[model samples]
Target: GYGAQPRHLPLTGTDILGPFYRPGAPDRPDGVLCDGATVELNGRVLDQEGKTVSGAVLDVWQADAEGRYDLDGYTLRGRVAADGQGRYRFYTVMPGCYDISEPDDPEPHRFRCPHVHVKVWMYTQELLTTQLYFPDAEHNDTDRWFDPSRVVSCASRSGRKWSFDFVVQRRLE
Candidate 1:
């Protein structure tokens, strides 16, 4: 253990981590949260050199059905540490629109597709911050956070699901 190097945190793109339970949605922490909506996130917290960024810290967040963060007080936020494998999971319900309740906002902020959010940290520095969007979700075209080129579908569609490896590019100093 004398030769252990301190881990660095991940720096994410502007995609913003995924969503959490908002203020107005039905609270069902233990039951099926949504129909046909499930997402599992996996990846390695690599360093600037792309080596295993073991023991990295992940801080992720998101809003509920009302599009409003319980910023007031919600358990949506979760903290998990990566194993030597640098992978993690938060099996939960798919995200829904914020229920804008008004049509005039013109700009849409609909329920985000079935997706998971992640913020990876290592070496005490941020390494990657981004949300993973599920493919074929009905709201893919309307989500305010979706980037046309960044969407990666679930395994069934792209066959990338069942088995695949996601790469997180680390910025080198």
Candidate 2:
């Protein structure tokens, strides 16, 4: 007979929202953002108990392949809806790393690793706000916001596919 209780899934780690986040990105049905080295990201939204959170909304934004943020337009930003199975998929280009340190700063402390910012919502309640990092990124160890728990593994290097699952805690009324 089983005696031990199952452990709950750990909540996905959080990261800074940064200064580039913009509201009201259009829904990306095709999931194509801009031109660059294309990559496919697949994942699911689940609660800490590992139960799927259906109909969850994911708002994603990131820099272009050149590591430039588009403040004038929605070049690399969009929203994706999780299916009934809590699965969400999107196609985007590989984001480039950029240094955000002050011009006169001697030590580079603000160099950012390539990452995709994401905000999850269930109905009207915000569930989580975090960024997705690439596995084996050069500056992951140096980036101040880098978290090992948020790094997504490359599913197929040949196909440029990456995968990550989001675990969130539901808001109690």
Overall lDDT per candidate, in order of appearance: 0.50, 0.87
Which predicted model would earn the best lDDT?
A: 2
Residue-pair clashes per prediction, in order, are 25, 0
User: For residues 73-114, what per-residue lDDT tens digits would candidate 2 score against the true structure?
Assistant: 898898889999999988898888888978888785476899
lDDT of 2 at 24: 88
Tell me the spans in candidate 1 whose CA falls farther than 4 Å from its real position: 1-13, 16-40, 47-50, 65-68, 99-115, 148-173
- In candidate 2 the C-alpha lDDT for residue 133 amounts to 92
Question: What is the RMSD of candidate 2?
Answer: 2.5
40-156: candidate 1 lDDT, tens digit per residue: 444445554446656766664554444445456534555556677765444334454455336665665345554455555565575666775655666778777765444553545
Q: CA lDDT of 128 in candidate 1?
A: 63
Clashing pairs in 2: none
